[PDB]
Structures are given as structure tokens and as C-alpha cells.
Amino acid sequence: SSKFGAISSVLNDIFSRLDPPEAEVQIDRLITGRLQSLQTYVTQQLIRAA
């Protein structure tokens, strides 16, 4: 639900109210952040599995 520095947390509104040349770099901020938050969850499980 967090925006992670973007303008919205839903993907459908990203492709609605802004130019198509900016939509590539705007949604690319969100996928890196969600991949970062997924990288934080796994590296806590490696500690817990030890």
C-alpha cells in the first residue's frame, strides 16, 4: 500500500494521468522498491534459518 516515492500505489492510475514518455521511469521506481522490500524479507529468513 505504500507509494515508495511514486505518485500512487496502484498501477492503473500510473498509466492514466501522465505522459507516456514518463510512465516508464515512474513505474520503474516502484518495482525496484518492492524488489528491495522483498530482498529485506528473505535476508531475515536466512538469519532465522540459522
Binding site: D19, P20, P21, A23
Partner: protein, 50 residues
């Protein structure tokens, strides 16, 4: 020789820059031309509807 007219009011480029145009090496080029009114110049951009 392109820099001959003073009111070249639109020369900005998307993937390249005017300074680096003389040091590149293009695979192939095309030149499309048409005549439109002055209000529709800003209507030519990737994804810019009008």
C-alpha cells in the same frame, strides 16, 4: 550547415543531443516532412495526444 536559420525554435531531441550529433554513426535515417499550423507543433511528442 543545418545551423543557418535563427528561429529554429524547436530543435530539442529525445534520444540524442545536438552537440553529440556530429560524433555519432547512424545505421540508417529517414526524413519525414509535412506542413501543420503553429498551434500543433507541441502535439508531436511520444504519447502526446491532440
Amino acid at each position: 550547415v543545418l545551423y543557418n536559420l535563427a528561429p529554429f525554435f524547436t530543435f530539442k531531441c529525445y534520444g540524442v543531443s545536438p552537440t553529440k550529433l556530429n560524433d555519432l554513426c547512424f545505421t540508417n535515417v529517414y526524413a519525414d516532412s509535412f506542413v501543420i499550423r503553429g498551434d500543433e507543433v507541441r502535439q508531436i511528442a511520444p504519447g502526446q495526444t491532440g
